[PDB]
Symmetry: C3
């Protein structure tokens, strides 16, 4: 199998796919909140679900959208950086640590966001998860630059 193209690749693919699934979970939760709170973004949706007054904003729907947006601001860059980093021959354990810190930090971020946990818990989880991303980005920069 081509999953063994590099020793770090299986770990990267596991963490990254779990994070994609975690984003899908946020999308599904958002839909559930829209239904339960009757807060739809579109008149056509609202008319099917009780009337035009249900095309409206809701603070919990907005919170779900913020968590999903923050995921897009961070997880998408990781999918790129982690893939490239997997092929730079990093120490297997060190690579695993980078991916695991990102995975745990991001899952914790969504829990802290949707769970409305006290500040600065969410901010700390965000920062933690970005650390391995910064590390991988710098490593890629050096490797790319030196091959120019």
């Amino acid at each position: 199998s081509l999953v063994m193209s590099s020793p770090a690749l299986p770990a990267f693919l596991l963490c990254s796919t779990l994070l994609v699934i975690k984003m899908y979970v946020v999308a599904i939760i958002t839909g559930q909140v829209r239904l339960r709170k009757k807060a739809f973004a579109n008149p056509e949706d609202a008319l099917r679900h009780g009337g035009p007054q249900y095309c409206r904003s809701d603070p919990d729907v907005e919170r779900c959208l913020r968590a999903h947006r923050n995921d897009m601001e961070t997880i998408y860059p990781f999918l790129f950086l982690g893939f490239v980093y997997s092929f730079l021959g990093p120490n297997p354990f060190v690579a695993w640590m980078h991916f695991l810190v990102f995975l745990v930090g991001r899952v914790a971020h969504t829990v802290a966001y949707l769970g409305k946990l006290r500040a600065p818990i969410r901010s700390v989880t965000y920062t933690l998860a970005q650390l391995p991303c910064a590390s991988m980005a710098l490593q890629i920069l050096w490797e790319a630059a030196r091959h120019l």
Copy 2:
């Protein structure tokens, strides 16, 4: 050519590039709607196009932005999942079907969204397109996990 690195890859690259172009079409439509409805997001834009009163929201611009955001929530994960899945040696026809269902579902989603089609047409197209994404994600999970 390296497009033949796997039998499923050409189909994946065709569908994924068409979807990127489809996102670009949404960006261009959004700009056209801003101009036609004189609804700009920035004072500097509004002042060039008739006055400060034209820095304002518009329901059709907001709808375009929702479609584009939903694209980012779904097409970007597909670009990752479909690329990896192409290298897991899937049945060629089965892979083609996964990519085609996603392509058709997503094009239909944008038509249903921007066309203001009755509910639940958009919701159904969304769900349809996510099915092959869930399928690919699970397959990647098993392949990655078993190589740990």
Copy 3:
């Protein structure tokens, strides 16, 4: 090193990683603006930073979010298109030019957006940067289609 899998790859990886870092800079700036203007998105954040009245919108925070969103609408597609394009055996100089126009255009876009530069400076930088993206997308389409 696997960075030399294709002659264009090091240049692509350099430009793409710099652009990811540039997105991270926008995220950090956004946080600084939230703090300085006391405009937080969440009640839990506001209560830590002076009171519930500080959960509020701010035009500069909104502008930062627009720049970051526009980045997600454009840089993420580039990460995909440029990666694939690097493996289609393009002329090295021509490829470098595609990546450099995108890099310069996007950095200029963020400067024009956050700097509130007069129209149509931002719109021009956006258009410039999209040109190589359109070019790469078409090239990928032909290469993928002909291998079906």
